[PDB]
Symmetry: D2
């Protein structure tokens, strides 16, 4: 069958909205409503990522992994039906001990055990028709969420990261002697989509949060943060210290390690940003000593499990029913598929750009 | 009252064996003398003026050295745990008031200095002196009569036990084990081949890991045969770099070496930073090294000191080891100095693994 | 100062809405009044003289009732957290000195009474009185101005939050989730249809469970609309006994009902014991009942009270629930009685879920 | 081909030492013979026909008995772990397909029969036969050569090691330790005085508990002496019941003894249900018993079987125990039988702790 789709030739690069031949084999058939894009989609189009590739036999890869889909047809089951809106899983499991319990996000082997829709050998979701198995679909249960549900994928990564935070913070009593997180200080390096999502969950877990960047911020972003009780600071003018939770979305060694030197005893550092091109920063013996004497834990986190998608939907609902303006304002452009230039340049004031599908 | 003691002037430096005046409380829970006291690089750095965070106890102009002690009880008030003549290992770190210190987890102090303090290091006299008074709660009883001087290894080993606790905690972030539930075939690499590295390596094997110590030069045949007695491999890494590492521990304190081995860590791997050296040269960590850590769900954890429970675990291990491999355990202690030989704080004996002081 | 307060004579019984002398205490940080106060079986059990463990404060001959409180700050010394006028829920359980109380986890007190004490229950005055003195630490600020009277539900919800904490701890003994990592179709059964049941059921739902409340009789259609509204089922187990349970929470305190539901619990099931009734008759647990528990690796966990942090989460859940289902959450508070109406303590408003007192 | 075996007709019962055909399957990784095989209450139950969940392997009329085994490798495919002549302990429980089985945690099978199977008990042949074929992954290598026959205690001891893992998981709900981080003075009581109670106590002591076994009659001086060597106490609870219990382990399966000891358990106390007996009579549990559990945040966890890692842990402890107290470990083995003495399944030669079969 012939259908419309946004494809790349991974890892060589390029993007075209075009026609392709997708035949059927499956438990469910779906179509897109919205599909977000992130740095990775752009990295794929730029040919900056060596780990991506087309599915076996084929010479293109359908882009798109941040999806909100609609069930057109479905097998016989007690969980979803025609008309239901769903978020598909990006990462699908291999055979390892972690994959086989639904924690492909903690895949013990890496590629080629696990695979990612739109990224590694699995067609993405920017195409008219999509076949899948029921278990790779997560039901949206809040009817008022609508398009905001497209933020699930970016948000699940945050929920897994926070899982990892909950795990490693058990090495000591991380809380105050009154049992709470009151006055505990979170700092998020960066002020884009992911940082925004980190900051909001942080707020829900009870931290005082403060996003940060190497420049002032738009009045758009500034107001959003205030709406969620989230501070901001240009670190070139006012450097925070005494940090209990450091989360990095920059990927820049120089910036990560300068903030690490502000981390409190028993502080946790979450590394989350890719930046393969970031310049090297010289980590010295004094830096190591600082980490050791303070029992600091630095943890890299990638992707997440199905359960985290569920958690993410629930949080989007709650935040939507309390600050709907600010949540809507996360999405900063909605785009036609033909508008393939969004993969090459960042619109003005972008936070999250999405593609509205016809 | 007047006693002999080995002292310094922290943080300035220097060392001397000498007479000093110390209080002689009539009221105390326990009164002890030292039998053996270990030295480590912190002692040597104290004495060389290399450590700036060390200080003398309030209103005093010396600091008695020594935090690795094996002591004997001279006298003690009625209690259910220890009595005159028993051997004990004293806690180094003493609790402040924070949430962690109040539960006996000062090793995880939330403030740092000056909430917690360490014997012979920060604001509290150490154990190289004729007489020592303490509370019972701060003493760990050696329950193995056969251990003798081996028990002086309790302090450097408890650091290892806490570090492995850190490992147990953080490795709960995914299934670390094989699909048969075990650690069989999991690979531990320990940067360094000194006494801390030996102790890490041995606990590693007890935990079921395949273990290899590594250094930037070949090792003595004695060390080699020690490693070989315990099933521990060695590798001069300039001739063959270990790869595919599940648990990596560093005792060097050296960035270049740390980050070089990080790049060989598997998915879900754990890196423990334990060593430190403030003089260590910088190493450029780039975006590529960050990504590597991220995409692998790697955890990098600093670990310092340990809790009293780790002292008990340490003693149990030293005893298990000694009753299996008595010789190689004895060979950890490579020199028994007298307190007059204060040059051991300056010059390392030849073939040093662990040097100790046999107190008069 | 003379003030209005409803009091009792712990443990013996009875209640008056009367004046009492409430002096200004020697040291305190905040002065407060009540806005609303919830009531539960325990208050009704104190009035009936049905609790041997309660007692009046030291020296005094009366106990102010009321532990389920919403309060307003009349005055408070300057701090970063609360201002005059703010609304707060006060902690019921106050810390002693054990290793758990000193960290803010007096809910897990290691000693029991007299280490911890509970406002309105165990040597401490409850909140049904015109003026209240307290420290800031023991107050939980409402940060959602929309919540209003719903915030008086924080106390009963707090207990449920702790219990889900206990479930998250003990359920780590094995993989409780499906092989997709979720709880989809895991079955929670709650014994009971009272206020605590509903609160368990709603949290159950936020955790991903399929939830069914149960009882030995049908339920009023106000209850069935609330249930249906949150997606919670109901079943009368005399006509339809649920089977195959993954999480069983009892709010009844009735042995025989407990142990008959335990026999429907699956491998790796968790049983939370929460409700209590000292009057309930004995069910004869036999060799098989135990065998059933053992072979399935079931965990039966008793849970009492909660920590401050759980008050904070309780308040956050109510906020979420209120902005999603404002009417069903409002529908929980079935009566706003007056201090004067000291009959509530004795009789139950017809089809009560939660009875509150609007304080003048 | 023809081999000797001891067999039952599960679940009917009976026992016989006889000849069976054992074909050499097409492909296998390992061929083994038994050296020693232990017997437990389960074997006696099987033979007695008292266990209705037991069954022969599909389309066979008999079931080879025996799950506590120590075997030697006759032949194995080349691999890096074991080789011919190596001694091993084979896994009793073999995995099915559920989320726990597939990660090597069949001991926590989410389904039970017939997902998981158990050698000698459920549809898989046991170890009392001349020849046994297995896969490597299912064998746990004995690394200490001095152990000898003592290594046959692995299987009963791995049950204990998993139950201590359950304890470690559940006791995270609060601070279970003293405020010095230790288990000093924490009280362990173990109901029963048989093989399992002894191994529970020894582990108990290694974890730092004060341990007391209890039974409802005095014990032979063989047993008492052994307790004494490991610093474990005993009490006939008819005469004297321990109180103030922090960890309670039951090996009786008897409700009345269980619940009577539950009412001695401290706040944050843990109870392990492990013993089972379907013939044990009912004992009334009332509202006030439930209430006692609730108010103390007690946890009651049933535990069955263990994972492969727990077999490896068991072997490590048996070594540690053997090099400290060789004579006393040997004494746990109280009778060595020849295969023709099938009497041991019906009558337990008195003074019994562990009866074993030496395979000729
Ligand atoms: N680990 C995972 O599972 C996973 C999954 C998806 C994406 N990611 C990564 O997560 C990162 C963040 O996602 P995103 O969608 O938020 O990306 P984004 O929208 O491009 O935002 C990146 C943020 O980092 C800021 N930044 C760059 N250099 C900085 C510095 N020196 N100091 C402070 N801030 C700095 C950027 O600011 P300006 O734009 O204002 O310069 C921007 O705010 C991306 O790098 C992506 O690689 C990770
Ligand atoms: N966190 C804590 O609780 C704690 C407590 C005490 C001490 N420490 C630290 O732990 C470290 C080790 O303790 P230790 O007593 O075992 O001291 P040590 O014997 O001096 O150990 C240092 C080891 O590291 C080796 N090394 C140095 N640079 C290296 C490199 N680039 N590559 C590989 N190996 C290298 C040394 O070899 P050579 O001798 O051949 O150069 C030596 O084997 C010290 O740094 C100390 O500062 C930490
Ligand atoms: N652990 C703690 O920290 C804590 C704190 C506060 C309260 N509690 C206990 O929590 C329990 C519930 O609190 P609550 O405020 O919800 O009181 P509640 O409204 O009385 O709830 C009790 C529920 O149990 C039902 N029930 C009684 N007997 C039953 C049986 N045999 N089978 C099935 N269901 C039965 C009742 O139904 P009917 O009304 O139809 O009889 C009622 O729905 C009380 O026992 C209280 O003592 C515990
Ligand atoms: N994974 C599991 O959950 C698992 C695995 C294997 C075995 N088991 C069970 O674990 C138990 C122990 O194993 P074992 O091999 O040690 O069996 P065992 O030697 O028969 O031990 C049972 C002990 O309980 C004592 N006893 C019986 N009734 C008692 C009572 N009312 N009060 C106090 N003590 C009482 C017995 O005393 P006398 O012998 O002097 O009567 C004996 O010491 C058995 O019940 C068996 O069913 C469980
Ligand atoms: Zn995998
Ligand atoms: Zn502290
Ligand atoms: Zn307490
Ligand atoms: Zn299974």
């Amino acid at each position: 069958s012939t259908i419309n789709a946004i494809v790349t030739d991974a890892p060589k690069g390029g993007v075209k909205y075009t026609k392709i031949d997708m035949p059927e084999p499956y438990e469910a058939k779906l179509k897109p409503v919205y599909i977000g894009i992130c740095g990775t989609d752009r990295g794929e189009v730029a040919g900056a990522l060596s780990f991506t590739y087309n599915p076996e036999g084929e010479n293109f890869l359908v882009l798109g992994h941040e999806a909100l889909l609609q069930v057109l047809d479905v097998s016989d089951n007690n969980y979803i039906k025609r008309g239901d809106f769903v978020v598909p899983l990006v990462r699908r499991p291999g055979k390892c001990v972690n994959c086989r319990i639904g924690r492909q996000d903690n895949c013990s082997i890496g590629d080629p055990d696990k695979h990612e829709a739109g990224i590694t050998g699995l067609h993405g979701f920017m195409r008219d028709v999509i076949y899948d198995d029921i278990q790779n679909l997560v039901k949206v249960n809040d009817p008022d969420l609508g398009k905001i549900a497209v933020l699930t994928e970016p948000l699940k990564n945050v929920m897994k990261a926070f899982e990892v935070f909950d795990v490693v913070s058990k090495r000591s009593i991380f809380q105050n002697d009154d049992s709470t997180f009151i006055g505990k200080k979170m700092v998020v390096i960066g002020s884009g989509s992911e940082a925004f999502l980190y900051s909001f969950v942080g707020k829900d877990r009870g931290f005082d949060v403060t996003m940060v960047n190497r420049h002032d911020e738009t009045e758009n972003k500034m107001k959003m943060m205030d709406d969620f009780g989230v501070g901001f600071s240009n670190y070139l003018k006012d450097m925070p210290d005494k940090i209990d939770l450091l989360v990095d979305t920059s990927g820049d060694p120089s910036t990560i390690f300068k903030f690490v030197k502000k981390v409190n005893n028993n502080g946790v550092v979450i590394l989350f940003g890719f930046n393969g091109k970031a310049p090297g920063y010289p980590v010295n013996g004094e830096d190591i000593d600082y980490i050791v004497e303070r029992n600091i834990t630095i943890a890299g986190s990638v992707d997440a499990a199905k359960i985290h998608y569920v958690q993410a939907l629930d949080s989007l609902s709650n935040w939507y029913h309390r600050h709907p303006q600010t949540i809507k304002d996360i999405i900063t452009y909605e785009a036609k598929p033909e508008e393939t230039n969004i993969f090459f340049q960042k619109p003005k004031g972008e936070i999250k750009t999405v593609i509205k599908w016809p």
